[model samples]
Every structure is written in C-alpha cells, then in structure tokens.
Target: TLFVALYDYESRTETDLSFHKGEKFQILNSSEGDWWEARSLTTGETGYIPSNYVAPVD
Candidate 1:
C-alpha cells in the first residue's frame, strides 16, 4: 500500500526511516507487528518504518 506520513518520525537506527508529515512511501514488507518496511518516494530511501506513523492513501 502507498502510505502517507501521519507524523514526523526520526530515525534512531541505521535501518530505520526518518520522514516528515505528508510525505509518501510505498510498502515493501512487514517485518514485525510494529515495523513495516517502506521505501520513500521522495528520497529513494528504504527502511523499516514505524507502522503507526503512516496511513494508507490514494
């Protein structure tokens, strides 16, 4: 799913993603129940993002 950042998230780890509100991302994989792998559309960056920080969008 294509998701939009619902909140600004700061990456605390090397494999995590940092994104600002309103940014868009594509869901690649869901690792744990809390972390979802996504690739940033604007930056061409990929990381495990906090699932609660993003939401599905058109």
Candidate 2:
C-alpha cells in the first residue's frame, strides 16, 4: 500500500525515517506493531515510521 505523511517527523533512532508533510511512501511491511516499514519515494530511503503519522494515499 501507498501512504502520505501527515506531518514532519525527525528520526529518533537509526531505524526510524525522517520525512516531511505530504511526502509519499510505499508500505513495505505493516504486520508488526505501531510502526510500519516504508520506502520513501522522494528519497529512496527505507525505514520505519509511526502508523498514525501516515494516511493511505488517495
């Protein structure tokens, strides 16, 4: 699935991703917990992000 960031977020850990509002990302894995693995379309970086920070891309 694809999603868009709702707000800016700075990575707090190496596993986390840094993204700005409206950035688009492709969901890689969403079966774990509150965090989902995603790949940033704008940066080509793959990392985890809070589930609530993104919404399904319309």
Candidate 3:
C-alpha cells in the first residue's frame, strides 16, 4: 500500500509508467527482474516501472 519513486522517469511507451522523485505509487507486481508493475496512487494509472526506481514505503 506504500511505495515511493526514487527518480523521475518519463514513459517512452504507452505501457510504461511515468513518475517523479518521491512520488507515491502502489506496487502491483514486484517479482520480476529490473522492471516491476505499479499503479500511481495520484493518477490511478498502472504500468511498468524500473524496480530500482522505487522502494517500499518507510
């Protein structure tokens, strides 16, 4: 229920997620390689984001 983006990322594809630093998101899926699926809590959008780009809510 808690996740945070580590850096700004502009989506290059329609399926990619765009987020800014310190932005909050929901982890929809994180059992993959470098990429993980997440949903934006602010925008209600879902897409793939870099696994290293986000971390569990502290």
Candidate 4:
C-alpha cells in the first residue's frame, strides 16, 4: 500500500531521497532499522528514508 511521513527532509547523497515535502512514498521493505528502502510516488524513484518517518496508509 501507499504511505506518507511525519514531514521531514533529507540529504545530497546518491542513496538518500531528494524531492519535495509533497512527494509521498511507499516502503519497499520494512526490515531495516532507522532507514528503509522507499519508492517515491512523484518520480517513481527509489531510495532510503527513515522508517521512523512513516506509517502504513496515513
């Protein structure tokens, strides 16, 4: 399912997600601590965002 975060920002690395706050994403996998692999809805891009930043279908 799709999801959104608690409204936070991130970095200038190749692995970090780079998009606007309006860019919501879905967690591709939830097995990691702190960070998880996420896929963006806006650009269909994949990267890491804090697992602490999101919830299931909120």
Candidate 5:
C-alpha cells in the first residue's frame, strides 16, 4: 500500500510524494485547510504535507 502527501501551505499542486505503508513519520505542525507540517523521521527534513494525501492502511 502507498499513500500520497503534499505540502499543506502549497495547496494540492506543490510538493507531492508517495509513502509506503507503515512508514514512520512525525507531525511537527500544521497550516491552513488540511495542510500539515511534518518531518521525515529518516531524513530529518521538515515541511508541510496535505492531509488528504494521508490514508488508512488498506
């Protein structure tokens, strides 16, 4: 299973990525709408990700 993520502040057209299931991550903060600020647990990079991109385990 895979989930899509995008920068919240940038809306749904900015940064986007697909994450594998069970990928560990941290939510640092949030912006407007469904946007959320998070950091890569493995890379230590922090940024915003759209909430719609996040989905439950299939």
Candidate 6:
C-alpha cells in the first residue's frame, strides 16, 4: 500500500517538517472529520494530520 501525505498548505511547510517526495510514513488512524494519525518514517513520533494531506497510494 502506498499512502502519501502531502503538504496541503504553505503554512504547513513553514511550520512543520515536510514529507519527501518518495518518503514513507505509517497511518495509524483516520476519522470522519478528515483527520488522520500518522508517524513519520524519518522520525518515530506520531501526530495528527489532516486526511487532505495524505493520499492512498496505489
């Protein structure tokens, strides 16, 4: 499975670490509010990111 979380806003890039073009991350959860739980591949910490930021990779 290829799930990708992309930067949806310019502010996000300015405030948070960016997910590289080919980097990988784990999806912990997804809710009806369009929020998702994810862990960065480069970092082990987990955080809640908007579902709009991510895409299910084929």
What C-alpha lDDT do the candidate models reach, one value each? Answer: 0.90, 0.95, 0.86, 0.74, 0.50, 0.58
Q: Tell me which of candidates 3 and 4 scores higher on lDDT.
A: 3
Q: Give the top-scoring candidate (TM-score).
A: 2
Give the per-residue lDDT of model 5 (tens digit) for 19-50: 44344447655445575666656565555666
For candidate 4, write residues 1-58 as lDDT tens digits. Answer: 7767667667569887765555678778768667778888878899988766666675
TM-score of candidate 4 to 2 decimals: 0.71
Top lDDT hit: 2
Q: What residue pairs clash in candidate 2, if any at all? A: none
Candidate 6: residue 29 Cα off by (Å): 1.5
* Prediction 2 global C-alpha lDDT: 0.95
- Which pairs of residues collide in model 4? none
After superposing candidate 5 on the true structure, give the runs of residues whose Cα lies further than 4 Å from its correct spot: 1-22, 56-58
Worst 10 residues of 6 by lDDT: 8-17
Clashes (candidate 5): 0
Cα lDDT tens digits, model 2, 1-58, are: 6899999999998899999999999998899998999999999899999999999988
- TM values, all candidates: 0.89, 0.94, 0.84, 0.71, 0.47, 0.56
Where does candidate 4 have its weakest 10-residue lDDT segment?
49-58
TM-score of 2: 0.94
Clashes (candidate 2): 0
lDDT of 1 by residue, 1-58 (tens): 6999998999998889999999899889876678988899999799999988988997
The lDDT, on a scale of 0 to 1, for candidate 5 is 0.50
Per-residue lDDT of 1-58 in model 3, one digit per residue for the tens?
Answer: 6789989999999878998999888887778767878888889899999878888889
Lowest lDDT sum, 10 consecutive residues, model 3, at 27-36
Clashes of each: 0, 0, 0, 0, 0, 1
What are the per-residue Cα lDDT tens digits for candidate 6 across 1-58?
Answer: 4466565322254323355544456877665456656676767556666666677766
